[PDB]
Design a protein around this ligand. Sequence first.
Ligand SMILES: O=C1CCC(=O)N(O)C/C=C/CCNC(=O)CCC(=O)N(O)CCCCCNC(=O)CCC(=O)N(O)CCCCCN1
Ligand SMILES: [Cl-]
Ligand SMILES: [Fe+3]
Length: 308
Amino acid sequence: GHAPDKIVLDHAFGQTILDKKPERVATIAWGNHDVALALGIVPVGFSKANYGVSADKGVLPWTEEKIKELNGKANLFDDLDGLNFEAISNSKPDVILAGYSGITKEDYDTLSKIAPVAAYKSKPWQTLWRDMIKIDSKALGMEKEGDELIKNTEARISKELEKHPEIKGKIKGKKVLFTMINAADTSKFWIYTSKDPRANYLTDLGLVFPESLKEFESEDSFAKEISAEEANKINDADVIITYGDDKTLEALQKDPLLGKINAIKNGAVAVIPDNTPLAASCTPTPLSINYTIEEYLNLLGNACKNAK
Ligand SMILES: O=C1CCC(=O)N(O)C/C=C/CCNC(=O)CCC(=O)N(O)CCCCCNC(=O)CCC(=O)N(O)CCCCCN1
Ligand SMILES: [Cl-]
Ligand SMILES: [Fe+3]
């Protein structure tokens, strides 16, 4: 029969060429294994999740669910402390997926000696969920199936919003900032920029970014650390999203500086329970979205009710 053409990947570290569809697939960093799994491929090895589950388990629920539905088993790399090059070698992969990753040039070179690497396009950790699918699925020789995975995922998002008309209308057009605010040390906090997939995902849910975000937008990173003394700059946000717990909101409202911020003052804050599957899903994968989007929308919806 007719064999597939060769695959040319243009990424941040140059170019990667595959001559056939890889049968043995390794993935690293975050989420890339879910792209392979959503395409019906069980990886010969992938990185332990360093967020959302105990280190003992190391695998997120939607990821584990798909694996068992494929009658496969989870082969985890012991790489919570950093890339485990030997473990990757032992898996004998034909390709290494890293479309969403923070690997360095040094990392890429070592990995490429093991197997062809699908790296990110621009800067570390600056890959949006659609682009993550595009990169990873192309490297698997499943570019066409990848475009259909994107289509079906976009459809799942849209249908879920349609299931909750009140929430959809409530959050539509609301100005949002995804942040990391620690109620313990409120002297400074993080704001994730539009280059970050967990911020971009919010625009898929119907929300928009305030114009103040542009000031913090840059080529540097996916997140910007700003002082609490500059908190007035984000008064144009209707709703603020941050990781935290059941004591976070009240602590922020009682903060002398942060408590003056409109969204915080109004209670228009979506607190995502830190180190839970829900929290981990905020940087979306095709598997995570289907698993958590309804719970996510309920938090966002409740926060946007307090928005003026
Ligand atoms: O390796 C990660 C772990 C979980 C993660 O970083 N998160 O942001 C999820 C919520 C984090 C929880 C508690 N962690 C830490 O608070 C520290 C600061 C932190 O993670 N931030 O996002 C703050 C801006 C970052 C510091 C730059 N650090 C890096 O560039 C690493 C990737 C980084 O910190 N990025 O956020 C890119 C993310 C790949 C998403 C998940 N992979
Ligand atoms: Cl509703
Ligand atoms: Fe982070």
